[PDB]
């Protein structure tokens, strides 16, 4: 519905991204989640609420 | 491949891959041959001459697939591990 | 105004009492916890009860609420 799709990109040098959905209207703030990076193999901070 | 009008099996499944261009010029030599090469020396020619790989073939490989007996000198062909041991065990010589 | 129903979900008891199971086997695919998990039985996310060790299925009635457990006897 209204809830958009975003890419959580990795803070390490890799291009690896998780992908998910955000309500852009009610939460306009960016979304930072310490997720797992399998190219670095380490839990790195992910950014970019699209 | 007509299932009534349902989307057929060869058309509801995705397609994968590509064709190599290079696997059509590689070959795969057993050890049952190379007693057939007339010489005790094995190159791409000496195999082509023995009607065993084909004229278009550029790469060849000497897979363990059974029972080398005579001492054979393999030249310029890739040899697998097990068949390196089998060629070198029955006299034999592998240079590249 | 009517004429619709969902597809039948095929719930129920898949392995009955005394029936020998392997580990991992689903015993009761069900909807709440009509049957609860007992010894060597796990309860999945959709309240599917599955054999966590090998053995025999044991339906029992335990506890102060007369709940229907499902154990597995080691066999």
């Amino acid at each position: 519905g209204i809830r958009e799709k975003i890419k959580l990109v990795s803070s390490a040098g890799t291009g690896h991204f998780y992908t998910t959905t955000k309500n852009k209207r009610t939460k306009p703030e960016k979304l930072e989640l310490k997720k797992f990076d399998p190219v670095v193999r380490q839990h790195v901070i992910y950014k970019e609420a699209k | 491949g007509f299932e009534g009008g349902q989307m057929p099996l060869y058309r509801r499944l995705p397609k994968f891959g590509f064709t190599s261009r290079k696997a059509a010029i590689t070959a795969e030599i057993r050890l049952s041959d190379l007693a057939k090469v007339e010489g005790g020396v094995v190159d791409l020619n000496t195999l082509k001459a023995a009607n065993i790989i084909g004229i278009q073939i550029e790469f060849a490989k000497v897979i363990l697939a059974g029972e080398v007996t005579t001492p054979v000198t393999v030249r310029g062909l890739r040899v697998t591990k097990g068949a390196r041991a089998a060629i070198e065990a029955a006299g034999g010589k592998i240079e590249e | 105004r009517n004429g619709r129903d969902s597809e039948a979900k095929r719930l129920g008891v898949k392995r009955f009492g005394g029936e020998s199971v392997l580990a991992g086997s689903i015993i009761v695919r069900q909807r709440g916890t009509k049957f609860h998990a007992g010894a060597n039985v796990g309860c999945g996310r959709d309240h599917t009860l599955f054999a966590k060790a090998d053995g025999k299925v044991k339906f029992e009635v335990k506890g102060p609420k007369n709940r229907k457990f499902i154990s597995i006897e080691a066999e």
């Binding site: 998910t20 | 099996l9 060869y10 | -």
Partner: protein, 64 residues
């Protein structure tokens, strides 16, 4: 004549060592962020064509 291969079937099935055919799983091209990673991880390896369907496949692929 000589039998023509159903050509878009050759791009989708590949013959194996004992005559069965492997194929890539469906459902893993797009709409993907809605799917669990357990689905997607179980759809990546290639799979054998089942018993029902080998008749159709062998009919479409007579040289492979």
């Amino acid at each position: 004549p000589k039998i023509k291969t159903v050509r878009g079937a050759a791009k989708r099935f590949k013959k194996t060592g004992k005559g069965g055919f492997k194929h890539k799983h469906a459902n893993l091209r797009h709409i993907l962020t809605k799917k669990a990673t357990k689905r997607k991880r179980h759809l990546r390896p290639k799979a054998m064509v089942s018993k029902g369907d080998l008749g159709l496949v062998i009919a479409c692929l007579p040289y492979a």
